Amino acid sequence: QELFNELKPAVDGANFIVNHMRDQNNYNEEKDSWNRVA
């Protein structure tokens, strides 16, 4: 359907945003673990 191609930039951008948030959260969690070790 043409709806899929029309919204594909939005779907890909949303997936990229989700991956960015998840990676940032994991990074922050590891830094928090290092803080607790200290």
Binding site: E6, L7, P9, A10, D12, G13, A14, F16, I17
Partner: peptide
């Protein structure tokens, strides 16, 4: 549907900005 086009534009802009943030 210009509203959906504007939504797509905003999402694309946000993803692009996060890409530049990653490169930096």
């Amino acid at each position: 549907l210009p509203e959906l086009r504007e939504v797509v534009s905003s999402i694309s802009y946000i993803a692009r900005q996060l890409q530049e943030q990653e490169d930096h």
